[PDB]
Structures are given as structure tokens and as C-alpha cells.
Design a protein around this nucleic acid. Structure first.
Ligand SMILES: [Mg+2]
Ligand code: NA
Length: 694
RNA sequence: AAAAAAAAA
């Protein structure tokens, strides 16, 4: 029996805060040990460790907490052990003395089977294991214990008194079975609070009266068309450009289309044409309000949760082929070296000639028998994109991009059959370079027009502390290093991290470097000074998101600001008010992050069940070593698995972790003879319910 | 918030 320390009185907290004795921060509990935590505070070169139950003082991941630094005698290094709630029962160091703002929402979990009596009718004290592996188990009291046994449940937490080792909560609702999929998708979206309800009648009431019969006007000065839409006479007719779009296979939500036309003077006319979402999505409407709140589209494996009604996303705003669409066009004159000669922005009417997938586009460009006007355009674009990318890389751009996973379904829409690691084609880079070009040109334009409230996106340099462990692993294990002299040194040394008799190693390190990045963040220009507009990863001075207004709210704002900048329409005073802008960025950074998390956890879920139906052996790479396990990346599946010590060894008493060598030594199960497993090792792995080292 | 860069979804 113990008692956590009582939180400091509210008056002690504000007195300590002011005297510089107490510090305030958001707690990040570690991704592998739930009884160990961190607070990042600009003072100290390193985040401050909070180690153990008492010191964490009933704090939940994400809590705004108040910490007190401990004496140097109590300073500790991070744990060499994996720990979640399910398996439970030197650096500057702090203790939690108070909880300022709590992150108790409704939480998804599953009953702990050993806390439940499956034959008892009466009310039981049972434990709930939360889906978030950062959190503690929660005691609930319920008469339905047996009926909730292998089910997906929502619980609410009520309290965690000083006197209790575990928080107390209650059952809220049932999602369904742990096998379901409907229940695991509802669970996933709750954990990341993505709104996925149908769009209200109020939202739908904003959509064009014509519905799917909406047509772009034939003549831009047609008196009828100009009466309903007076701004149409500022719209440029570009229905003469041989435009095309290049997207993933079978994609309905087409944001962008491109053209390239050789000019009379030797230069290039290049257009990037983007769905004109802000023509349909007006400020202060219920439709703008639902989209602003959603902030982003969320892509799950089996499911897309739209920011906007699909009448817009997949029909009227989509730059569909062979149909006249409105657009917002960025038009450059380019050198044959891809240097900007001039740039111009305009609302337009477009007619995409063809919608290609990446693969079809690639094969058409590489098809020596095809010599038509569209193919030559596409070929011109690929060429300009190569030069564009070359210049980005010379300027110090990072190329951290690795092959990602697409899961394929079987007999059912939620029953997964196989995992595809996506191969990059040159057309992927063709589109990316012009998206980048579009986004940079508009960011300069809107910051020009609105120096105080421009919708921008920055990316901080990583502290050296972000790369401290990875560089130590690379030195001790490989005699290699990642340089942080600059982003160019970072990119070049990363490129040179090569194992001759193992091409994957370089990709292993590239993916591991990506996790050492700072988060890129939307911001309004007035919040920072110009040198802090810096996008580190992209090595450009100013950046924004413009090219995807169907699926991201940042681009809706940027679009309005560009229409403001070119004198097409006045900018809504909403996007000229710093306080409203500041609240918008806060929200959309939150929606962006949540969507990345939800995305990844859907993939992890489906891939995990693909591998569960697979008996065979795979290649793995060790990306992490602990005293009681190893984390192994399996590239064929694109996912990590923990291999726990009870599976590596009988005699865990002799397992030995060498922290400076990143080496676990153990007597494997068959044997008498010890075995060394190091970070980075290529190993053989198989699933026999559990991942095992062959 | 020091809570994973970029592009298309
Ligand atoms: Mg596109
Ligand atoms: Na397309």
C-alpha cells in the first residue's frame, strides 16, 4: 500500500511558477515505458525526465502539468525496459506537483480477462486496458463484466485519488467485438476524435442548387451567368490548355492538374491548376464551419472521412477529365533550366484532357511510339521537374521519403489479403515538384499581400539532442554518422550511410531519421519574424499548403488570401483577425496530427492481421533493443513488432543488456550458448499469435 | 507542446 504525493496547493503553484522554482509543460510519456515521462521546456538542452509512479503523480499523457526539478542525486537516465499497463504487476529529472489542464476525454479499451469472473452475475471490480499504450489501466465497477469480456468499450475516467494505485472510471458504451472491424474503426476514430457523422441538412443546404447538374458557363460574359456570379468576368478562360491530372489509381478527388506549352520565345508556359474550392465554400456558412472544424480529410485503410460533402470533393470541385471545371491557376514562364522568369495567379475555367494514374502517365511518357501534344507536355514537365528537384537538393532539401503501405482486401471490404509496399515512379516526383513550386509561389504572394495574417507552414531545425541516440547507435555499431552542420550535410551524410552487401540498410536509417524530425507547423505570418518562416526539411524560406483545398482546410484559407492578393475578391475579415487566425492554426495542426496518427494505426491494424494469417518467415531489422525485448522492423509488411524476452529466452535471469553497445545477450530457448543481438542487425522473424526470432 | 520532413491520396 502507498499514497501518491498530494498536489501542491494552487497558491503554491503560482508562487513557484513566478519564483522560477516550478515549471509548466505538457507531459509526453515514453512510447515504450508508460511509467516514465518527459517534459520539454526551452530551458535545459534536453527534455526533463519524470521517472516512476510517484513522480509522474497520476499524470496522463498529454496533461498540462507543473514540475519541480529534483536534486542532482536523484537524476536518472532513461529506462532500459519496455512497459505497458497490461504487463506491469544520467539526465535532469523532475517530479509532477500539479495537473493544470487534463486530457481526460472518453477512452477506448478492453477488459482485463484476469480481473473478470466469467461465471459471476453480481457486480465486479474489473480493470480496463486502454487502447492508448501510454495510459494506465482503469478500475471500473460493473454488473455486466462477463458480457463485456472480449469487446471494444468506451469508458470515462472519474478520478484518481491520492489513495488509489489506479484511476477510477465507468463504462460508457459498447462498440462491438474485438474481431469486428466496424468496432475497430469506430474505436480508432474516437481515440483520435475524428468527426465522421453524415453532413447535416444545414451543410447540404449550402451546396449549389443544381447538384450534380452544375455546369461551368460556356461564355464568361454571358449576362445570365454574370448576374448570379458577378466575379466571373475576372475568371480566365484556359479551356485551350492541354491539361491533365496524375493521381493514385482510381482516384475521384482530383485536386490538381498540370500543363506545359512551349512559348514563342523558347521559354515554358507551365500551369498548376487547383480545384477552386472557395468558390463553393464561403466564409461564415455552415459548410465552411464543418470543413474548418474537420480541418482535414482522414484516410483510413478501408475508409475516407471527407472534410467536405462529396458533391464538391468528387464531382464539382474535382478537376474531372473531359468536363469544364473552375480552378485557381498558377502560371509561370520557366527557363529551360526551370528558373522562374515570371509568375501569375488567376481564377480560371479549365478542361482536363485526361486523368491518369501515376503508372499510366509513366508508361505513356516512356512509350517511344507516342508523340502527341499531351505526351510532349508531360515529357516537358518531367524534364523541368528533374531540374527543379536537382536545385532543391543543392539548396539543402531533405529527401526522407520511403516506400509506404497499401493494404489489399479479400472477400470482404474489411478482410485484408495482402500488403503492398509502393514503388516510386518518376511521375510521382513530376507532380511533387510542381506542387512544391505552386505552394512556394503562392506563399510569397499571400505573405506579400497580407504580411500580418498570411496562412503559412514552417518546419523547425531539429536540436542535436533529437539525433543524439541515433548518432551514438551509428557510431558504435556502424562507424557512421548523421551530420547536423546543415540540412545539406544531413541529407548528404544520410545518402552516404550505405552497407554494400545490404541495400535496405540505407532506407532503415532514412526512416529512423524521419522520427528525429520536429513537427512542421501551420502558422499565421504575424506570429513569427521572417527567418522563423523557414521550412528546414524543404530548405525554403517560406512555404504554405495551397494545392489540396478539397482535403485540407489550410488550403481553403490560402485560396481566399490569394483571391484577396490578386484583387479578385476582398479577403474575409476572419482571415485578417490575428486571434481568429491563431485559433484556426491551433485547430488544424491538431487535426493534421490526429489524421496522421489515425492513418498509421489503421495501417498497423490491417497489416497486423495480414501477418497473423501468415505462417512464414520474414526479413527483419532491429531498430530498438531493451533489457526485456527487441523492436524489429519488417520491411515486407512496413510495420514494427516487439519481440518480448519470454519468447527469446528461457532463463531471462541471464539476459544481459549492454546499453553502450545496444546489444541484448541471451541464452536462446534451445541452448546453453549465449547469443548477441544488436541494433541494426538483419534478423529472421516469424509469426507462430506472437512474433518470434528465427 | 520540442507532441514525425515532403508529395498525391
Ligand atoms: Mg492530384
Ligand atoms: Na488523376
Amino acid at each position: 500500500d502507498f499514497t501518491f504525493p498530494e498536489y501542491y496547493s494552487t497558491a503554491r503553484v503560482m508562487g513557484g511558477l513566478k519564483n522560477g522554482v516550478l515549471y509548466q509543460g505538457n507531459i509526453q510519456i515514453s512510447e515504450y515505458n508508460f511509467l516514465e515521462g518527459s517534459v520539454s521546456l526551452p530551458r535545459f538542452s534536453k527534455p526533463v525526465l519524470i521517472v516512476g509512479q510517484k513522480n509522474l503523480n497520476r499524470a496522463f499523457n498529454g496533461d498540462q502539468v507543473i514540475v519541480e526539478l529534483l536534486p542532482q542525486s536523484e537524476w536518472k537516465a532513461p529506462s532500459s525496459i519496455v512497459l505497458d499497463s497490461e504487463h506491469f504487476d544520467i539526465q535532469p529529472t523532475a517530479k509532477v506537483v500539479y495537473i493544470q489542464r487534463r486530457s481526460w476525454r472518453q477512452y477506448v479499451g478492453q477488459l482485463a480477462p484476469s480481473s473478470v469472473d466469467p461465471q459471476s452475475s453480481s457486480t465486479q471490480n474489473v480493470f480496463v486496458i486502454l487502447m492508448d499504450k501510454c495510459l494506465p489501466k482503469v478500475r471500473i465497477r460493473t454488473r455486466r463484466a462477463a458480457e463485456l469480456l472480449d469487446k471494444r468499450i468506451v469508458i470515462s475516467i472519474d478520478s484518481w485519488p491520492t489513495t488509489h494505485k489506479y484511476p477510477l472510471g465507468h463504462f460508457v458504451r459498447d462498440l462491438g467485438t474485438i474481431e469486428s472491424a466496424q468496432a475497430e474503426t469506430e474505436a480508432l476514430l474516437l481515440e483520435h476524435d475524428v468527426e465522421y457523422r453524415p453532413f447535416s441538412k444545414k451543410v447540404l443546404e449550402c451546396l449549389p442548387a443544381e447538384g450534380h447538374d452544375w455546369k461551368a458557363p460556356t461564355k464568361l460574359d454571358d449576362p445570365e451567368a454574370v448576374s448570379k456570379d458577378p466575379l466571373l468576368t475576372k475568371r480566365k478562360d484556359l479551356r485551350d490548355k492541354l491539361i491533365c491530372s496524375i493521381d493514385p489509381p482510381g482516384c475521384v478527388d482530383i485536386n490538381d492538374a498540370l500543363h506545359a506549352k512551349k512559348l514563342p520565345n523558347g521559354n515554358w508556359e507551365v500551369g498548376v491548376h487547383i480545384a477552386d474550392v472557395t468558390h463553393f465554400v464561403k466564409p461564415g456558412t455552415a459548410l465552411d464551419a464543418e470543413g474548418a472544424a474537420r480541418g482535414t480529410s482522414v484516410y483510413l485503410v478501408d475508409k475516407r472521412i471527407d472534410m467536405l460533402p462529396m458533391l464538391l470533393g468528387t464531382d464539382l470541385c474535382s478537376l474531372k477529365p473531359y468536363v469544364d471545371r473552375f480552378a485557381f491557376s498558377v502560371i509561370w514562364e520557366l527557363d529551360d533550366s526551370a528558373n522562374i522568369v515570371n509568375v501569375n495567379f488567376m481564377k480560371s475555367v479549365i478542361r482536363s484532357r485526361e486523368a491518369f494514374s501515376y503508372e499510366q502517365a509513366q508508361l505513356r511518357i516512356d512509350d517511344k511510339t507516342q508523340n502527341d501534344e499531351l505526351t510532349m507536355g508531360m515529357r516537358a514537365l518531367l524534364k523541368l521537374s528533374v531540374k527543379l528537384k536537382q536545385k532543391r537538393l543543392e539548396a539543402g532539401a531533405l529527401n526522407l521519403a520511403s516506400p509506404e503501405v497499401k493494404v489489399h482486401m479479400d472477400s470482404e471490404t474489411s478482410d485484408p489479403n495482402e500488403v503492398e509496399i509502393k514503388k516510386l515512379l518518376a511521375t510521382n516526383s513530376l507532380v511533387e515538384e510542381f506542387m512544391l513550386l505552386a505552394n512556394i509561389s503562392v506563399a510569397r504572394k499571400i505573405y506579400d499581400a497580407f504580411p500580418q495574417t498570411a496562412m503559412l507552414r514552417r518546419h523547425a531545425a531539429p536540436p542535436s539532442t533529437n539525433f543524439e541516440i541515433l548518432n551514438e547507435m551509428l557510431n558504435t555499431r556502424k562507424n557512421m554518422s548523421i551530420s547536423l552542420e546543415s540540412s545539406k550535410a544531413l541529407a548528404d551524410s544520410l545518402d552516404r550511410c550505405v552497407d554494400p552487401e545490404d541495400p535496405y540498410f540505407n532506407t532503415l536509417v532514412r526512416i529512423m531519421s524521419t522520427r528525429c524530425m520536429m513537427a512542421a507547423q501551420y502558422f499565421y505570418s504575424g506570429a513569427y519574424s521572417y527567418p522563423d518562416f523557414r521550412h528546414y526539411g524543404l530548405a525554403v524560406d517560406i512555404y504554405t499548403h495551397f494545392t489540396s483545398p478539397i482535403r485540407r482546410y489550410c488550403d481553403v484559407v490560402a485560396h481566399r488570401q490569394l483571391a484577396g492578393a490578386i484583387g479578385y475578391e476582398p479577403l474575409s475579415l476572419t482571415h485578417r483577425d490575428k486571434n481568429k487566425m491563431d485559433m484556426i492554426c491551433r485547430n488544424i495542426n491538431r487535426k493534421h496530427r490526429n489524421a496522421q496518427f489515425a492513418g498509421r494505426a489503421s495501417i498497423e491494424y490491417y497489416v497486423g492481421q495480414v501477418m497473423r494469417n501468415n505462417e512464414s518467415t520474414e526479413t527483419g531489422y532491429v531498430i530498438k533493443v531493451f533489457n526485456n525485448g527487441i523492436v524489429v522492423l519488417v520491411p515486407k509488411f512496413g510495420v514494427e513488432g516487439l519481440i518480448r524476452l519470454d519468447n527469446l529466452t528461457e532463463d531471462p535471469n541471464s539476459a544481459a543488456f549492454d546499453e553502450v553497445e545496444y546489444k541484448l545477450t541471451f541464452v536462446p530457448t534451445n541452448s546453453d550458448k549465449p547469443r548477441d543481438v544488436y541494433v541494426f542487425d538483419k534478423v529472421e522473424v516469424q509469426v507462430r499469435k506472437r512474433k518470434a526470432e528465427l
